[PDB]
């Protein structure tokens with residue numbers, strides 16, 4: 001598998017070399033969003049945690065369609081600020097409970113290296 005540690009300092013540089021196939025070899029869930037919150041990448045580990053079929057969610061809006069429970073100042077509010085500020089690095093716990101068993105996770109959001117893309121990393125706690 002891919003040996004990348006959750007919350008690593010240079011994770012945006014390392015994941016810059018990973019294709020969709022490589023992302024699926026991570027020890028934790030990984031989502032790539034555009035500045036509007038549309039889903040660009042969604043790896044296997046994330047799909048194990050949420051039950052979503054990765055291919056099926058790419059293209060939908062994370063905050064509108066897929067994960068309305070994140071539509072809150074505590075999640076989406078922080079996202080919208082990072083995008084507007086052009087910088088984002090934050091780590092917090094949250095509960096995912098839409099159409100699923102309530103699951104506690106640690107979330108790390110961080111701006112990608114290139115363009116207008118942002119990472120959302122998730123692991124169980």
Ligand SMILES: *C(=O)/C=C\c1ccc(O)cc1
Pocket residue numbers: 050052057066067068069070095096097098
């Ligand atoms: C609330 O809706 C939280 C999270 C979440 C994450 C991924 C997917 O697919 C659904 C929901």
